[PDB]
Amino acid sequence: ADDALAALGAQLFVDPALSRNATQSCATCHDPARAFTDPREGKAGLAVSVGDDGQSHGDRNTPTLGYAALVPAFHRDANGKYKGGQFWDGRADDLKQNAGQPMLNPVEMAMPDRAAVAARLRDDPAYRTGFEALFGKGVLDDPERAFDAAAEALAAYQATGEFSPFDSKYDRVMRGEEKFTPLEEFGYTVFITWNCRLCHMQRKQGVAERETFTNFEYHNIGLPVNETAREASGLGADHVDHGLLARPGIEDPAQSGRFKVPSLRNVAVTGPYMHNGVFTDLRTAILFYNKYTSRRPEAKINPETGAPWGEPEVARNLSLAELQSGLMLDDGRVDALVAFLETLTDRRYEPLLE
């Protein structure tokens, strides 16, 4: 089942007939060639993706699908900290629940309802063969089963080795196959002795077996609005992205502005950065952390804009305990981190580095 189930998910992933005007598939916004992210440019750059209607833009940046399958389902641990889930705000429990929402999102694939999606699947005899072999006959005659099966197949497809190969240079180094460059090792050491490790490691202590450089927690690191992406989303300037608080069921006002800690795997090749896609460059996303540690004036400036970083979109709930480490990363270490984060790039996406 699960071998062929993924094959059906592979068919659907690249099928643009899951979108109203038949213009876009998962592969459109999650391009396999680009670490499963969107190469296309809308009104606000690559910060947000354009929907099926070629008009509607999202509010958030499209994340890699690579290594999302290792993120555990959304839950709250004994600490009181939330962990796991899908979407920058964790509003999806897991890959399965996540897969459906793009299909039905007017500002994305823009299928009006589940019934419309079923109709498209019956257009293909390939599906009626493949779907009915895995979920039995008549599956495509039922909107609810088909949509769900398609979501499940898409989920399964994303849980294959093709999405999480662990064939990055980091992976080969930890297996003893090759060594880090002095700068990469320096970056790793910095990465596991500075605040980076507090949020971007699977564990607090001990050895993780399949590290994806996220603890799956939710933090507000105090990012500002993305001026241009925000206009493009059409949600108004008065609108506030409350991150995790926007997940249904989450009412705790301490989670306002908190976003899922993203896996730093493939990070080098999935710009722009953060939930709102505000930072074009990776170096910029690293230097942003120094506004909490550096006494220096340049730390206040966003190097991309040349102007003050900007007031956080959400001022309260900052992870200051972690962020205010009393230690400023110098450029030397910022270099080191850029290098180490590059080692988390997959084999097939290594060529993209430059």
């Binding site: 930890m174 060594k179 050491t189 596991i192 490790r197 507090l198 607090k204 202590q205 305990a321």
Partner: protein, 125 residues
């Protein structure tokens, strides 16, 4: 008790200065003042900052990155004083330097040294 002799790790007693995880420890083992191997004693503050050392585990024959972390805000415990320096580099290479009072990021800006924990962050390399 030959101080200059090559440091021989053991996995049988964390309070002794020859415990495999204390390979680059400076000061006092927290397990002697109310902490434990990887936790701080009560009333002290855990630094977010750390310094690392690849300590060889003699049990499985595998090295481990030990990000040591100081417990702070107290006078020095005076109990189980250990000063090991496996991999310890000078201060200009701080990540591997252990004379430093690594108390940064501790609550209430605590900077006084009490003792040190010895937790693994990964397998070395």
């Amino acid at each position: 008790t030959d101080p200059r002799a090559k440091w021989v790790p053991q996995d049988n007693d964390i309070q002794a200065c020859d415990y495999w995880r204390h390979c680059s420890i400076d000061g006092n083992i927290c397990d002697c003042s109310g902490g434990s191997l990887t936790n701080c004693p009560p009333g002290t503050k855990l630094a977010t900052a750390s310094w690392v050392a690849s300590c060889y585990n003699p049990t499985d024959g595998q090295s481990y990155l030990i990000a040591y972390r100081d417990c702070c805000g107290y006078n020095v415990s005076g109990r189980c004083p250990c000063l090991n320096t496996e991999g310890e580099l000078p201060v200009y290479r701080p990540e591997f330097a252990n004379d430093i009072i690594w108390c940064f990021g501790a609550e209430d800006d605590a900077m006084t040294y009490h003792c040190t924990i010895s937790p693994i962050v990964g397998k070395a390399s």
